[PDB]
Write a protein that holds these residues in place. Structure first.
Motif, PDB file in Angstrom:
ATOM      1  N   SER A 143      41.545 -23.540 -11.691  1.00  0.00           N
ATOM      2  CA  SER A 143      40.658 -24.036 -12.729  1.00  0.00           C
ATOM      3  C   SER A 143      41.239 -23.826 -14.126  1.00  0.00           C
ATOM      4  O   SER A 143      40.958 -24.613 -15.031  1.00  0.00           O
ATOM      5  N   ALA A 144      41.977 -22.749 -14.349  1.00  0.00           N
ATOM      6  CA  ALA A 144      42.608 -22.581 -15.655  1.00  0.00           C
ATOM      7  C   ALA A 144      43.580 -23.726 -15.927  1.00  0.00           C
ATOM      8  O   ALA A 144      43.700 -24.196 -17.062  1.00  0.00           O
ATOM      9  N   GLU A 145      44.289 -24.187 -14.892  1.00  0.00           N
ATOM     10  CA  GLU A 145      45.154 -25.343 -15.098  1.00  0.00           C
ATOM     11  C   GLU A 145      44.324 -26.586 -15.362  1.00  0.00           C
ATOM     12  O   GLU A 145      44.639 -27.379 -16.264  1.00  0.00           O
ATOM     13  N   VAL A 146      43.254 -26.758 -14.587  1.00  0.00           N
ATOM     14  CA  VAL A 146      42.332 -27.880 -14.779  1.00  0.00           C
ATOM     15  C   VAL A 146      41.814 -27.895 -16.205  1.00  0.00           C
ATOM     16  O   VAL A 146      41.768 -28.943 -16.846  1.00  0.00           O
ATOM     17  N   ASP A 147      41.443 -26.724 -16.733  1.00  0.00           N
ATOM     18  CA  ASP A 147      40.931 -26.647 -18.100  1.00  0.00           C
ATOM     19  C   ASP A 147      41.984 -27.084 -19.115  1.00  0.00           C
ATOM     20  O   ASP A 147      41.670 -27.787 -20.087  1.00  0.00           O
ATOM     21  N   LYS A 148      43.247 -26.712 -18.893  1.00  0.00           N
ATOM     22  CA  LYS A 148      44.311 -27.193 -19.777  1.00  0.00           C
ATOM     23  C   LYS A 148      44.454 -28.707 -19.690  1.00  0.00           C
ATOM     24  O   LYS A 148      44.556 -29.385 -20.715  1.00  0.00           O
ATOM     25  N   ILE A 149      44.469 -29.259 -18.477  1.00  0.00           N
ATOM     26  CA  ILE A 149      44.522 -30.709 -18.334  1.00  0.00           C
ATOM     27  C   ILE A 149      43.329 -31.374 -19.016  1.00  0.00           C
ATOM     28  O   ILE A 149      43.468 -32.442 -19.625  1.00  0.00           O
ATOM     29  N   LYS A 150      42.128 -30.782 -18.881  1.00  0.00           N
ATOM     30  CA  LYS A 150      40.919 -31.371 -19.463  1.00  0.00           C
ATOM     31  C   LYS A 150      40.993 -31.457 -20.989  1.00  0.00           C
ATOM     32  O   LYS A 150      40.327 -32.292 -21.592  1.00  0.00           O
ATOM     33  N   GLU A 151      41.789 -30.617 -21.634  1.00  0.00           N
ATOM     34  CA  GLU A 151      41.944 -30.749 -23.080  1.00  0.00           C
ATOM     35  C   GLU A 151      42.371 -32.159 -23.486  1.00  0.00           C
ATOM     36  O   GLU A 151      41.933 -32.671 -24.522  1.00  0.00           O
ATOM     37  N   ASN A 152      43.210 -32.812 -22.681  1.00  0.00           N
ATOM     38  CA  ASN A 152      43.689 -34.145 -23.015  1.00  0.00           C
ATOM     39  C   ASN A 152      43.115 -35.242 -22.138  1.00  0.00           C
ATOM     40  O   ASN A 152      43.307 -36.424 -22.448  1.00  0.00           O
ATOM     41  N   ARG A 153      42.400 -34.892 -21.076  1.00  0.00           N
ATOM     42  CA  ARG A 153      41.675 -35.870 -20.263  1.00  0.00           C
ATOM     43  C   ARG A 153      40.367 -35.207 -19.842  1.00  0.00           C
ATOM     44  O   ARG A 153      40.326 -34.478 -18.850  1.00  0.00           O
ATOM     45  N   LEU A 154      39.299 -35.458 -20.595  1.00  0.00           N
ATOM     46  CA  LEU A 154      38.124 -34.608 -20.471  1.00  0.00           C
ATOM     47  C   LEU A 154      37.479 -34.742 -19.094  1.00  0.00           C
ATOM     48  O   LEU A 154      37.001 -33.752 -18.527  1.00  0.00           O
ATOM     49  N   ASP A 155      37.484 -35.945 -18.526  1.00  0.00           N
ATOM     50  CA  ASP A 155      36.868 -36.190 -17.229  1.00  0.00           C
ATOM     51  C   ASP A 155      37.761 -35.788 -16.048  1.00  0.00           C
ATOM     52  O   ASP A 155      37.367 -36.007 -14.891  1.00  0.00           O
ATOM     53  N   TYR A 156      38.914 -35.179 -16.299  1.00  0.00           N
ATOM     54  CA  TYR A 156      39.785 -34.814 -15.193  1.00  0.00           C
ATOM     55  C   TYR A 156      39.093 -33.809 -14.284  1.00  0.00           C
ATOM     56  O   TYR A 156      38.496 -32.834 -14.753  1.00  0.00           O
ATOM     57  N   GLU A 157      39.157 -34.076 -12.976  1.00  0.00           N
ATOM     58  CA  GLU A 157      38.866 -33.093 -11.940  1.00  0.00           C
ATOM     59  C   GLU A 157      39.966 -33.102 -10.883  1.00  0.00           C
ATOM     60  O   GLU A 157      40.596 -34.124 -10.608  1.00  0.00           O
ATOM     61  N   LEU A 158      40.163 -31.961 -10.249  1.00  0.00           N
ATOM     62  CA  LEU A 158      41.104 -31.914  -9.144  1.00  0.00           C
ATOM     63  C   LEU A 158      40.676 -32.951  -8.099  1.00  0.00           C
ATOM     64  O   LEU A 158      39.512 -33.008  -7.704  1.00  0.00           O
ATOM     65  N   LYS A 159      41.583 -33.834  -7.713  1.00  0.00           N
ATOM     66  CA  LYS A 159      41.225 -34.925  -6.820  1.00  0.00           C
ATOM     67  C   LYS A 159      42.252 -35.082  -5.705  1.00  0.00           C
ATOM     68  O   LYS A 159      43.395 -34.658  -5.825  1.00  0.00           O
ATOM     69  N   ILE A 160      41.810 -35.730  -4.620  1.00  0.00           N
ATOM     70  CA  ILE A 160      42.681 -36.063  -3.502  1.00  0.00           C
ATOM     71  C   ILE A 160      43.948 -36.721  -4.037  1.00  0.00           C
ATOM     72  O   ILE A 160      43.898 -37.536  -4.965  1.00  0.00           O
ATOM     73  N   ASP A 161      45.086 -36.344  -3.457  1.00  0.00           N
ATOM     74  CA  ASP A 161      46.438 -36.827  -3.731  1.00  0.00           C
ATOM     75  C   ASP A 161      47.055 -36.184  -4.970  1.00  0.00           C
ATOM     76  O   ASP A 161      48.266 -36.315  -5.163  1.00  0.00           O
ATOM     77  N   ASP A 162      46.310 -35.440  -5.784  1.00  0.00           N
ATOM     78  CA  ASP A 162      46.987 -34.549  -6.724  1.00  0.00           C
ATOM     79  C   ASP A 162      47.902 -33.600  -5.930  1.00  0.00           C
ATOM     80  O   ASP A 162      47.608 -33.242  -4.783  1.00  0.00           O
ATOM     81  N   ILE A 163      49.010 -33.176  -6.530  1.00  0.00           N
ATOM     82  CA  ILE A 163      49.982 -32.304  -5.852  1.00  0.00           C
ATOM     83  C   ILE A 163      49.984 -30.913  -6.479  1.00  0.00           C
ATOM     84  O   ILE A 163      50.136 -30.771  -7.692  1.00  0.00           O
ATOM     85  N   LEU A 164      49.873 -29.887  -5.646  1.00  0.00           N
ATOM     86  CA  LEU A 164      50.023 -28.492  -6.093  1.00  0.00           C
ATOM     87  C   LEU A 164      51.489 -28.125  -5.959  1.00  0.00           C
ATOM     88  O   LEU A 164      52.042 -28.214  -4.859  1.00  0.00           O
ATOM     89  N   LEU A 165      52.110 -27.753  -7.078  1.00  0.00           N
ATOM     90  CA  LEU A 165      53.497 -27.322  -7.124  1.00  0.00           C
ATOM     91  C   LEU A 165      53.532 -25.811  -7.334  1.00  0.00           C
ATOM     92  O   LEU A 165      53.383 -25.339  -8.462  1.00  0.00           O
ATOM     93  N   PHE A 166      53.763 -25.086  -6.240  1.00  0.00           N
ATOM     94  CA  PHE A 166      54.019 -23.652  -6.256  1.00  0.00           C
ATOM     95  C   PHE A 166      55.526 -23.403  -6.373  1.00  0.00           C
ATOM     96  O   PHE A 166      56.327 -23.954  -5.601  1.00  0.00           O
ATOM     97  N   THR A 167      55.911 -22.557  -7.321  1.00  0.00           N
ATOM     98  CA  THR A 167      57.287 -22.129  -7.456  1.00  0.00           C
ATOM     99  C   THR A 167      57.377 -20.630  -7.205  1.00  0.00           C
ATOM    100  O   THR A 167      56.613 -19.851  -7.776  1.00  0.00           O
ATOM    101  N   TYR A 168      58.280 -20.262  -6.309  1.00  0.00           N
ATOM    102  CA  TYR A 168      58.757 -18.891  -6.093  1.00  0.00           C
ATOM    103  C   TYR A 168      59.703 -18.526  -7.231  1.00  0.00           C
ATOM    104  O   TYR A 168      60.806 -19.075  -7.333  1.00  0.00           O
ATOM    105  N   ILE A 169      59.290 -17.590  -8.073  1.00  0.00           N
ATOM    106  CA  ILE A 169      60.142 -17.086  -9.148  1.00  0.00           C
ATOM    107  C   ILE A 169      61.039 -15.967  -8.643  1.00  0.00           C
ATOM    108  O   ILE A 169      62.260 -16.007  -8.818  1.00  0.00           O
TER     109      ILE A 169
END
Lengths: 131, 121
Positions: free
Chosen positions: B70-96
């Motif tokens: 949701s913190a990422e969603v909130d950042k995205i919502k700053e520039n697209r207010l109606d954005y919600e996590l939706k089907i076919d969005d991709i989660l990119l996990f990186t091993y640091i």
């Protein structure tokens, strides 16, 4: 699916065998033992050969690894007359099944290059997992 | 390093969790045991939290995973207010590095999307 991305460097271009890190040996080549072999084929060429895991000194691919690469380079030359494998091109290995793999060369000019290069970031090695 | 790409599907949305399969547990989360925690930050938000590996009852990510997403969603919502996590969005996990990860949402309109979806398929 799992994929292994490797950027070409002078050591690959020069040596007869590609070095891989231990993480790759375990997580992508299934903890293979010295002198083990896997099948590998090139995507553009369907050239299939046997590639060997060499664990002396450090983990290395041998056997047919350079013949597969050279066969893929041969296919690219059909369309890119002046093409030689070069530094910072990316090798894309795809795990198909146990001891079965595919290999593709991602050129600087490929439309996938910027994003894939983006993911590789600083390393020369990257595993990508999905599903 | 390594990366794990997880496409949002109806199961994730319905079940409100990210399930963990045996291969991802072994090769991306280093054979973590039940209740082991990793550090994980969101890329756009730099929000850091602890994410648990919960193997009892239904293997899944737990702990701070919902707060990172949701913190990422909130950042995205700053520039697209109606954005919600939706089907076919991709989660990119990186091993640091060991027990240390980052997470980013790749939307359909991200210029990276088509190439990353190509790898998944």
């Amino acid at each position: 699916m799992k994929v292994y991305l490797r950027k070409i460097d002078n050591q690959i271009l020069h040596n007869k065998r590609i070095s891989i890190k231990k993480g790759i040996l375990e997580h992508f080549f299934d903890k293979a033992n010295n002198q083990d072999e896997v099948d590998m084929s090139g995507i553009l060429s369907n050239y299939n050969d046997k590639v060997s895991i060499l664990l002396a000194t450090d983990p290395r691919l041998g056997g047919g690894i350079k013949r597969i690469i050279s066969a893929e380079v041969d296919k690219i030359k059909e369309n890119r007359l002046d093409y030689e494998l070069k530094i910072d091109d990316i090798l894309l290995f795809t795990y198909i099944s146990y001891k079965k793999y595919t290999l593709e060369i991602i050129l600087l000019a490929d439309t996938r290059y910027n994003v894939l290069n983006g993911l590789i970031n600083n390393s020369k090695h990257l595993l990508v997992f999905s599903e």
